[PDB]
Amino acid sequence: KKIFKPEELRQALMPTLEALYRQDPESLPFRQPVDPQLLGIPDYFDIVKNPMDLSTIKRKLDTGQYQEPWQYVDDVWLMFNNAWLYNRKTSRVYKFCSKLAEVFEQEIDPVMQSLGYCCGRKYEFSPQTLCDDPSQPQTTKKKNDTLDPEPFVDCKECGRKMHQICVLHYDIIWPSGFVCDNCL
Amino acid sequence: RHRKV
Ligand SMILES: [Zn+2]
Ligand SMILES: [Zn+2]
Numbered sequence: 285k286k287i288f289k290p291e292e293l294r295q296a297l298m299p300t301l302e303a304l305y306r307q308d309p310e311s312l313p314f315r316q317p318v319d320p321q322l323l324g325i326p327d328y329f330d331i332v333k334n335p336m337d338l339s340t341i342k343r344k345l346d347t348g349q350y351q352e353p354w355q356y357v358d359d360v361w362l363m364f365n366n367a368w369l370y371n372r373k374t375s376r377v378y379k380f381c382s383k384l385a386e387v388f389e390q391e392i393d394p395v396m397q398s399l400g401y402c403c404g405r406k407y408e409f410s411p412q413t414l415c416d417d418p419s420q421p422q423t424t425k426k427k428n429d430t431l432d433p434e435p436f437v438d439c440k441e442c443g444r445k446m447h448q449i450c451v452l453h454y455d456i457i458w459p460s461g462f463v464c465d466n467c468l
Numbered sequence: 469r470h471r472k473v
Contacts, residue, residue, distance in 0.1 A: 313472065324473035377472050 290348030402450030
């Protein structure tokens with residue numbers, strides 16, 4: 285039911301993207317689409333099926349391609365995830381990526397809350413003890429350190445995707461379906 | 469496997 289107009293998204297979200305751009309040296313490999321010729325990495329599109337970068341995200345905000353702000357968050361993490369996948373853990377570009385992600389995680393919650401959401405945190409806080417997703421880079425002995433996306437429940441009334449753990453509590457029941465605060 | 473050069 286809630287529709288987000290482009291200028292409302294751009295106004296709220298763009299300062300989170302500028303916070304990334306401000307990071308120097310860290311944003312510099314993220315400022316333009318990876319060019320595997322220039323960078324000497326001819327196997328790049330063998331590994332990254334769905335590239336993403338700061339300029340494409342800015343252009344998506346600037347031209348109204350996101351309908352709702354979790355689509356922006358998903359692209360931010362697709363960019364991060366691509367880079368943590370392709371580059372080795374010891375590489376400069378990987379380490380820069382982790383810094384950008386730290387910066388993002390600290391910026392996104394207040395801004396998502398200004399847009400009516402619970403928070404802006406994509407991934408669960410830790411892996412589940414053992415007994416895809418638009419940001420997961422696709423693929424055509426393990427180690428238990430994967431973080432899955434925090435699952436959602438939609439507000440029945442406005443259509444906002446809210447996290448189950450942010451809005452559903454152990455002592456509250458919603459027989460007619462979840463409704464968010466304001467809306468309520 | 470290549471690396472950013
Ligand atoms: Zn939340
Ligand atoms: Zn609602």
